[PDB]
């Protein structure tokens, strides 16, 4: 997408303050609780029934780190996010069968967890650039659904 250098700086600055170990687990677990139908893909993870269960499931936490870790490549390739996630988009579409609208609520929830952790330093202006980035990421993750 067409990105300015300032935009690029903002996104790297936000991602610099992100603790993958804290934010992934929280973001992922909050998605499973607020939109409980997304639990249908996490059958092998054991009990993802309740918040309490969800929030203490180790496989959930581990997966949260994986998902959030994968954003690093988006963060580091802002010129070509589409192409960087092509392959990832095909395993989601063809091996995992994740409804791509699910990437949209995840993006919203991640944003919400980030706001909780950054507080007031997550300014409206920063949130606007983060939301433009989230939108390209979401679109990239849902691009190989045919």
């Amino acid at each position: 997408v067409e990105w300015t250098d300032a935009e690029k700086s903002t996104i790297s600055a936000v991602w610099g303050k992100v603790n993958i170990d804290e934010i992934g687990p929280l973001a992922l677990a909050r998605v499973l609780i607020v939109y409980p139908w997304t639990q249908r893909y996490f059958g092998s993870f054991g009990n993802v029934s309740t918040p309490a269960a969800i929030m203490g499931n180790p496989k959930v936490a581990a997966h949260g780190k994986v998902v959030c870790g994968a954003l690093d490549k988006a963060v580091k390739n802002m010129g070509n996010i589409l192409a960087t996630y092509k392959s990832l988009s095909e395993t989601h579409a063809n091996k995992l069968f994740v409804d791509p609208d699910n990437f949209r609520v995840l993006a919203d929830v991640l944003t919400i967890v980030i706001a909780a952790k950054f507080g007031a330093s997550f300014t409206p202006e920063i949130q606007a650039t983060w939301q433009k980035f989230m939108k390209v990421v979401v679109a990239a993750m849902g691009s190989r659904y045919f």
Partner: protein
């Protein structure tokens, strides 16, 4: 929020459409899978997801059937739709946003098969009703 006018319109149009409901279902599902391929993610066990395939044709009549049943439950769709909601909510776990996609593909098929009967007036009422069936089905999700 169905008004009595909305309900009388849906009922006058439905009596006219009821003989081709299986055809309409089959085709709306087929159209949805093909034009909105993200919905194909819920039917990955099915052998053929093409328009006209058996799985598709059978499942579309089942869905239309439930909607025709809903025309009789318009007074209490939430309560009327309760058990199917439960199913979609806890067994199938179908993201609710897919209900609007199906709805749009149903209107396209209705226009196609009943272009003269599918007036603006019929259009707005059936859209509201499909939205209310979607809402009823979504009710128990969380």
């Amino acid at each position: 929020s169905l008004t009595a006018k909305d309900k009388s319109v849906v009922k006058a149009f439905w009596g006219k459409i009821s003989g081709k409901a299986d055809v309409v279902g089959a085709e709306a599902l087929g159209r949805m899978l093909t034009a909105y391929p993200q919905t194909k993610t819920y039917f990955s066990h099915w052998a053929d997801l093409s328009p006209g395939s058996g799985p598709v044709k059978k499942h579309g009549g089942i869905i239309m059937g439930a909607i025709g049943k809903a025309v009789g439950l318009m007074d209490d769709l939430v309560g009327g739709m309760s058990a199917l909601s439960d199913l979609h909510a806890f067994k199938l776990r179908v993201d609710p946003g897919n209900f609007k996609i199906l709805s749009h593909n149903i209107l396209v098929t209705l226009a196609i098969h009943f272009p003269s009967d599918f007036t603006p007036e019929v259009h707005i009422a059936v859209d509201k009703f499909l939205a209310a069936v979607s809402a009823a089905l979504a009710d128990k999700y969380r």
